[PDB]
Design a protein around this ligand. Structure first.
Ligand SMILES: C[C@@H]1CC(=O)[C@@]2(C)CC[C@H]3[C@@H](CC[C@@H]4C[C@H](OS(N)(=O)=O)CC[C@@]43C)[C@H]12
Ligand SMILES: [Zn+2]
Length: 257
């Protein structure tokens, strides 16, 4: 029922998901001058060498690459985190044009897209239990700007024609998510939420300062996806981003000076 349109988009979500007006909603604007450098923050540990990708799926609100999270193979540790977080999936949010698409903003700047690598805390045993906990999930957010191609994204772009409509999936084995990371792991962190329904307040956000560059041809392929199922009136999957929500009583911390 929910979506990104005039009649079912972000301003409607609170009716089915009243936590939409809660105290730790995401995304937020990152005011770079107000974010406090925290020398106590650890470097982020991204251990993706044994990652096992399984499938690529159009879920009607994004496309996602799902991983085997039945063991500690692709894990996030350190940074602001206590314990070990398993990679479940990554997905993107993007715009109809390059001047919008990101969920987080930086001094009100919107990027063309935002990559979310979703991880869950192994102390809760499964992701369904983890989404009920304030420290259940860690989402690594990476901004995309348009310029030079990202070679590590091309394997993803080239299969999107096979998952055009809601509910379509394909084999997507042997994909290495290290190819989607920028040079620097400098980050901002704050306590927040899932950015789609059910908007659960279960996420430690880790947003990288350094964007990755993708080509116009790569983001054009995102924009050919469809929100609709096959047969249904064609509605391009564009502008699948929630705007910035009130920061309320929260501090954004920077890992860097
Ligand atoms: C599988 C877990 C358990 C659960 O209840 C689910 C299904 C809610 C929806 C979640 C999913 C985890 C992966 C995604 C995270 C995304 O949030 S974001 N955009 O902040 O990264 C919201 C959409 C998403 C599919 C959750
Ligand atoms: Zn997301």
């Amino acid at each position: 029922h929910w979506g990104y349109g005039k009649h079912n988009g972000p301003e409607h979500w609170h009716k089915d998901f009243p936590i939409a007006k809660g105290e730790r909603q995401s995304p937020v604007d990152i005011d770079t001058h107000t974010a406090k450098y925290d020398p106590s923050l650890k470097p982020l540990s991204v251990s993706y060498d044994q990652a096992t990708s399984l499938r690529i799926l159009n879920n009607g609100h994004s496309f996602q690459v799902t991983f085997d999270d039945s063991q500690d193979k692709a894990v996030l540790k350190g940074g602001p985190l206590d314990g070990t977080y398993r990679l479940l999936q990554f997905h993107f949010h993007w715009g109809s044009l390059d001047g919008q698409g990101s969920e987080h903003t930086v001094d009100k700047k919107k990027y063309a897209a935002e990559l979310h690598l979703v991880h869950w805390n192994t102390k809760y045993g499964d992701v369904g239990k983890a989404v009920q906990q304030p420290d259940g999930l860690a989402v690594l957010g990476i901004f995309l700007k348009v310029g030079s191609a990202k070679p590590g994204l091309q394997k993803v772009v080239d299969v999107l024609d096979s998952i055009k409509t809601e509910g379509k999936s394909a084999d997507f084995t042997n994909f290495d998510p290290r190819g989607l990371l920028p040079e620097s792991l400098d980050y901002w962190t704050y306590p927040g939420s899932l950015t789609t329904p059910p908007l659960a307040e279960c996420v430690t956000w880790i947003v990288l300062k350094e964007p990755i560059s993708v080509s116009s041809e790569q983001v054009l392929k995102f924009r050919k996806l469809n929100f609709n199922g096959e047969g249904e009136p064609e509605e391009l999957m564009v502008d699948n981003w929630r705007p910035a929500q009130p920061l309320k009583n929260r501090q954004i911390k920077a890992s860097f000076k």
